[PDB]
């Protein structure tokens, strides 16, 4: 099933070849080229009809490999209709090579459908929450004011940020010109900052309401909640629009200047100061507040069990009941999902400031998509109340 190429036959066997053909450049002296040979025998049989495996011995046929810039061996070039679709320079296992071939044979279609469901979950989920709070008199509580702030931030992520994001990934270029690149980038940072800062404010709201319910009623008014909400949006604006629209975020580097001059380029390139300052204000200060606050809810509940056991006069030791285990799960989901979604992106974002070439561009963009996924998660996490569930069923006919 494997074709054994020469220099003469290469144009007919590979460039003029029907469909997909995987070219292996190997040598009799190269130990990593012997290691892959028995894996390509299995792939030639298992991927029958999907691709053709072709082998070229570099010792016998030295003339072909320089034309495609072969620096190391074994190198596997997948060809599609006279052109090199995908490249590698290292030896692999059968399992790792199966994944590479599956990814490049199917023309990235999974990638595009996965953006579509993300937009659908974010818009459906958040419209349903704003509707539920807006329609139902019982849901218009002080907490649900902060939930409404969050719901709007995540909604604008689904309607405007993720779509224009999706297009830049698909087309590989920015079609809407320099201004809308700057406006879209500002709208991204605004809504992500507003979302994550409002998660932090919700943590503080629930902590006061749980640990200090009578102090919370007098201390947290509707007027004070409005001021807090307005402050989070004001901060979000002054970190997003003010720096991006006035070009303060701009790096001086000439490779960066080519992206700022070209309307087709909408790469997110920041100076060190903006990358740090925006990351701290959007994520790390909110994350530390949420860790500190939700820890004091755990400590309070644990210490309150100590008060119950102390007051027994050594009669009963309390164990975790259903209510405590559910509470501890809810705490797990809040910190778990928020951190999983946004820590990788903001960790990588601070790592680029130190050494630029360490983390690839795909990983950076992929982690930013994982952050956008949090906007779909937040309705699921923060709107589980019986009153929410009643209203959701009432709105769905």
């Amino acid at each position: 099933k494997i074709i054994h190429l020469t220099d003469d036959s290469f144009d007919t066997d590979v460039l003029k070849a029907d469909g997909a053909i995987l070219v292996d450049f190997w040598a009799e002296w190269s130990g990593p080229s012997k290691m892959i040979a028995p894996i390509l025998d299995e792939i030639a049989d298992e991927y029958q009809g999907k691709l053709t495996v072709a082998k070229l011995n570099i010792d016998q046929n030295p003339g072909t490999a320089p034309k495609y810039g072969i620096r190391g061996i074994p190198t596997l070039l997948l060809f599609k209709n006279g052109e090199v679709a995908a490249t590698k320079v290292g030896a692999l296992s059968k399992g790792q090579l199966k994944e590479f071939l599956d990814a490049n044979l199917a023309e990235a279609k999974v990638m595009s459908l996965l953006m579509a469901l993300v937009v659908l979950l974010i818009v459906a989920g958040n419209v349903l929450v704003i509707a539920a709070i807006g329609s139902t008199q019982r849901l218009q509580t002080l907490t649900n004011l902060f939930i409404t702030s969050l719901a709007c931030a995540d909604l604008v992520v689904g309607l405007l940020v993720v779509p224009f994001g999706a297009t830049l990934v698909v087309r590989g270029t920015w079609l809407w010109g320099s201004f809308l690149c700057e406006l879209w980038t500002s709208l991204d940072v605004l809504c992500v900052t507003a979302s994550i800062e409002t998660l932090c404010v919700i943590a503080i709201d629930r902590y006061l309401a749980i640990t200090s319910p009578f102090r919370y009623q007098s201390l947290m008014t509707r007027a004070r909640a409005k001021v807090i909400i307005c402050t989070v949006w004001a901060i979000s604006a002054l970190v997003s629009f003010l720096p991006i629209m006035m070009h303060w975020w701009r790096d001086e580097d000439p490779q960066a200047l080519k992206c700022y001059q070209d309307p087709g380029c909408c790469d997110f390139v920041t100076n060190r100061a903006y990358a740090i300052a925006s990351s701290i204000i959007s994520f790390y200060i909110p994350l530390l507040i949420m860790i500190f606050v939700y820890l004091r809810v755990y400590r309070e509940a644990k210490e309150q069990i100590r008060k119950i056991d102390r007051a027994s006069k050594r009669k009963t030791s309390r164990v975790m009941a259903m209510k405590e285990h559910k509470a501890l799960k809810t705490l797990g989901i809040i910190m778990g999902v928020f951190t999983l979604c946004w820590l990788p992106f903001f960790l990588v974002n601070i790592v680029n400031v130190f050494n630029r070439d360490l983390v690839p561009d795909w990983l950076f963009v992929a982690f930013n998509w994982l952050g956008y996924a949090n906007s779909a998660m937040n309705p699921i996490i923060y709107c589980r109340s019986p009153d929410f569930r009643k209203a959701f069923k009432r709105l769905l006919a």
Partner: nanobody, 119 residues
């Protein structure tokens, strides 16, 4: 979770009663146990409430007269009601606000125990 109410009934004006509510069932460590009342032809209103943390909150009508406390170990809340007036006549309800959901509170209500103060 069941809220069993005792201690109510008939008492002369100037007299005292002691309501007790024993909450049998799974409640989160952090909670607020309380006494609400509904007088005839009025809406339900908070009498008194005591947080797990030991904070208290009383209606101005019952300040100085009524004292709310909870049992040191058990989920049992006591409203000692002194200097009772015919104004205080009402169906008194035990309430437990459980905070185990973290993002919302769950309400439990007692059936309610009649208190009638005569002049």
């Amino acid at each position: 979770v069941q809220l069993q109410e005792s201690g109510g009934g008939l008492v002369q004006a100037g007299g005292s009663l002691r309501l007790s509510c024993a909450a049998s069932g799974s409640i989160f460590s952090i909670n607020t146990m309380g006494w609400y009342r509904q007088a005839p032809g009025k809406q339900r209103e908070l009498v008194a409430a005591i947080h797990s943390g030991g904070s208290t909150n009383y209606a101005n009508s019952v300040k100085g007269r009524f004292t709310i406390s909870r049992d040191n170990a058990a989920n049992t809340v006591y409203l000692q009601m002194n200097s009772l007036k015919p104004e205080d006549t009402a169906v008194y309800y035990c309430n437990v606000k459980d905070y185990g959901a973290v993002l919302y509170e769950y309400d439990y209500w007692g059936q309610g125990t009649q208190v009638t103060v005569s002049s």
